Design a protein around this ligand. Structure first.
Ligand SMILES: Nc1ncnc2c1ncn2[C@@H]1O[C@H](COP(=O)(O)OP(=O)(O)OP(=O)(O)O)[C@@H](O)[C@H]1O
Ligand SMILES: Nc1ncnc2c1ncn2[C@@H]1O[C@H](COP(=O)(O)OP(=O)(O)OP(=O)(O)O)[C@@H](O)[C@H]1O
Ligand SMILES: Nc1ncnc2c1ncn2[C@@H]1O[C@H](COP(=O)(O)OP(=O)(O)OP(=O)(O)O)[C@@H](O)[C@H]1O
Ligand SMILES: Nc1ncnc2c1ncn2[C@@H]1O[C@H](COP(=O)(O)OP(=O)(O)OP(=O)(O)O)[C@@H](O)[C@H]1O
Ligand SMILES: [Ca+2]
Ligand SMILES: [Ca+2]
Ligand SMILES: [Ca+2]
Ligand SMILES: [Ca+2]
Lengths: 294, 294, 294, 294
């Protein structure tokens, strides 16, 4: 039986979602699940390797080792918040040669938001604003370059973090200077972009060959029909770093009728709307299909 | 043989000139070496041996001068959470070597966490009461997780340990407070929140040895007469951590007539007003007296 | 009833050890226990404050808040190992004005081993080697000063860590250089001291007015009679940073008959030998006595 | 108008002199700006605008020169875990700005974690086999907790990501391995362990564009003829991360006749031997050709 390690929080019972799924209608799939914080590993160039997972057995913490044949990463591999760095585990998994969704290569390169955004910048130069309306954004390697903004208000996004973390709205120059000094204390990079007075925002997702668009109506659901414009946004983004099996594009719709793409997320993208259960099943088949190629 | 005094301060002030002619016991001369924390390193041995190394430029080449200070005057901040502002190990090394200092190395070390210093002031307020020691209301958060709200707005949030306005922001409402806490998380350190004071002017009461002065500066200059009120503020504060030879107390004077003590500063306090020259001579006198005792 | 917060691992049931103890034979003591990693807090200058403890209730993680009237710290407040920094909690407790054993002031100043060692260096200059045989040791603020050792082998101790962590034996110059480069990666201070070929080592402890000496026979019990020589070692060390209620002195006995004091530990000192249960009871009375003064 | 080339390298080499006279399409001139990572900063905008700022000394004052490179040649390491050796955000910024480079910014970024690079070599060994690609046996540890033992001694432990011998130690036995792991914990990063090779000599096979050279250096120099064996090592490695215009493979030759590939280097590879001058001209040629394509 093939062993699948799924790195996600306990809320979703992936074992139950993969129950009965087989590779070539004959080989069974054993699902192992845990969060990055409860994992460790050792990998050898000769191919030998082990993944150690801390779990609870009869009220006591124990370590059980496994050897995944495949991995599904649903959690962020990196966050500049304390204790949120698991890049070394991603490196170890690649070192062990274990296949993954999304690919370990893409997961590693997704560990710096501005690095991913740089990929969108290139796509925007290539496609033009009409087809790919990337929001204006400025990147500062560190606080020394954060002197001013030519327009206000702007949204400052500090380092690499998720779920609203490290993000603030700045209304004037004096406050921008105060915020830049806070960036100094984070000792990392930051970006600034025009604040969009949004009527609503839109997220276009792509799991395998399945698409869905959702309208979400400052720091914040109804589904909407896919359009070829939306399809292009996510299709082109899904091509970076060798290809993203699970990804989505976030855009803000201004009260002036303009769209502004502000981010592309990877295999850790949250499932939203009234069809989350369906999305999990779609993820299962994609994983199953990917595992079949081995 | 002359007694060597190391002054840690920027070059602007020529302490050698100010100490020129000064003698210990009217016979022993004083040799003045001066450098900034960034130009220093050292090695100390439990047996008493040590060397304070000063990096200097010679014939366009980086060379090192080895000194054995008999005493040290510290005029720069020993710590800042901004990149490369950490000189705590030098303070540790100077104490390891047993070198006497102004202010004391013990107090300098304990002054490296603003809230730790504020904690002493909290104790003094509990003891003396509001009328005599009007300490501003303040809240300490070990980390961003406890920053949920503020009973009153606007507030001034001060992040970690930093100087010259760095990491200090004015928050006007609850939602903004939340966004600011999401950024505190990127600093990975503590923070405090205190009521924003609509000040009419702020006052700073300084004490150098036995010389007192008071200055009035009217959101981030006139000398005024000392009062027994002011004298009590600085006399009380000057006693913490075994005693501060040089220190000052900063208080904001609200428009409703209330005073709010917001900070106590050590030997790094900047010299201000039309008596800076006199203050420097006063420091010279204080140090020579401290040096005489050894 | 007075609330006592004991910060220690779960192995010891402090509630059971404090069961029945009363202040003035009438006031009861409610014992709360948890580790630094499961705690957080908020403190206000006006005296208001809360300590939040994460615990498990029916298999789920919950937060219950308390307001300790006193604290007993049996765990290290700082370790440079990942996620081992709880200095901000110690700062918060002092900010809230909560009494402790050992004192919060001493616990804070014990967060840098070389800073504590500097205190022993001063005691050695004062008492002399015959009475206080402090081991030779060299302090490096950073790796740039770690060039060589005049004798080998030596023991290199990196940064601030416990239970053998960060400590290695270096036999020659080339290896010393390799180790110094490792120090560069820790980006912190380090010390080097002669390697003692020890017949055995000795630890002299002092809990309140109770003393005990233990012989422990490279990186490693039988009790031994207190002597006035041993008593002097711990008595003098127990006086630093305003006084240590719980502390011990570690010394190595060379095969050449010389003793070498290498460290002084605080209220987190481990209980050893066949009288640990007794030591816990002695700790209880000291705490009870200390609490009675409030 | 001339095309601007920014060379990131130490001053020792005068790339302006080597590029002097070179022209793109025989008509367009090349302007050479040169600086070290430590002297650079930048700001990049999604709209294409950007500025690479070079700090320089003018009339004894620190001033900034703003440049807009059309291409960049990177000859220095972009990352080191030693204090202030982190220039990853500059690499991110140069890509954000869309500036073409040698080696590619993508490969430079992915080369910032030695084991991540080694993981690619692991893959190549699995594919080509030992006879053609003799990759040394190596073990990857995400952190110190998994470092428990080594099947064979002595071993060479390499900590985190650093250069010029930094963080690399030779361990001769099990107990020492444990002590070394206790220090890895202070580095708070990953480490690898590989068999110590009792080498007779080591070889480095380099590839600059289409020019190959091989050098023999006989525990931490003669040119030899290229072989199809050597050509295959560097040709294979030169293909990772989309292709390496400049790279080299380091292999240790054991006394038992076995070869052990221990490392692949990128555009920062030092120039060695009696053909350094020629190698520089070869790099000039390679860059001019890459610049011609734009
Ligand atoms: N330029 C902007 N103008 C207006 N609102 C913005 C802007 N950027 C972000 N926001 C708001 O802030 C929210 C959070 O920001 P964003 O989506 O960039 O970060 P995040 O959700 O923390 O990122 P991650 O996907 O890593 O979790 C957005 O969903 C949106 O409501
Ligand atoms: N609660 C407050 N209300 C209004 N203004 C404040 C308040 N706290 C600080 N300020 C203003 O900010 C200025 C600087 O803040 P503060 O003195 O606390 O820090 P700092 O100057 O950065 O510290 P340091 O003295 O270390 O350099 C004060 O002089 C005052 O003008
Ligand atoms: N100079 C030395 N010579 C020989 N052995 C030494 C020396 N220093 C330490 N050791 C050995 O290493 C052990 C651990 O070192 P040490 O006691 O200094 O650190 P630790 O126990 O990690 O400190 P902590 O008390 O913070 O837990 C000692 O108990 C002793 O066996
Ligand atoms: N397994 C090994 N056995 C014996 N010697 C080794 C081994 N690994 C490395 N060395 C020696 O150490 C030298 C330097 O190590 P290595 O090239 O791995 O790192 P480095 O030079 O620090 O890295 P970089 O190339 O980034 O600067 C090698 O040239 C070789 O002489
Ligand atoms: Ca988002
Ligand atoms: Ca101030
Ligand atoms: Ca010890
Ligand atoms: Ca090398």
């Amino acid at each position: 039986a093939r062993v699948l390690l799924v790195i996600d929080e306990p809320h979703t019972d992936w074992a139950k979602y993969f129950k009965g799924k087989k590779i070539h209608g004959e080989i069974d799939i054993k699902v192992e699940q845990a969060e990055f914080s409860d994992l460790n590993l050792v990998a050898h160039a000769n191919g030998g390797f082990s993944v150690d997972m801390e779990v609870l057995r009869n009220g006591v913490k124990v370590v059980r080792s496994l050897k995944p044949d495949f991995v599904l990463i649903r959690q962020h591999a990196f966050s500049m918040a304390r204790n949120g760095d698991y890049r070394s585990l991603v490196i170890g998994l690649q070192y062990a040669g274990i296949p993954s969704v999304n690919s370990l290569h893409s997961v590693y390169n997704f560990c710096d938001k501005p690095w991913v955004f740089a990929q969108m910048v290139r796509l925007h130069k290539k496609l033009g604003t009409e087809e790919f309306p990337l929001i204006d954004q400025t990147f500062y390697p560190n606080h020394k370059e954060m002197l001013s903004s030519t327009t206000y208000p702007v949204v400052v996004k500090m380092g690499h973090a998720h779920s609203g973390m490290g993000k603030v709205k700045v209304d004037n120059q004096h406050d921008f200077q105060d915020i830049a000094s806070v960036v100094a204390l984070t000792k990392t990079y930051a970006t600034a972009e025009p604040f969009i007075d949004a009527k609503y925002d839109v997220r276009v997702q792509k799991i395998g060959q399945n698409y869905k668009a959702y309208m979400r109506t400052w720091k914040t659901l109804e589904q909407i029909a896919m359009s070829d414009r939306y399809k292009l946004w996510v299709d082109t983004c899904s091509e970076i770093f060798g290809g993203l099996d699970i990804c989505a594009v976030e855009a803000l719709h201004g009260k002036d009728g303009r769209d502004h793409i502000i981010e592309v997320v990877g295999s850790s993208m949250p499932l939203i709307g009234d069809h989350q259960d369906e999305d999990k099943q779609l993820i299962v088949e994609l994983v199953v299909n990917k595992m079949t190629q081995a």
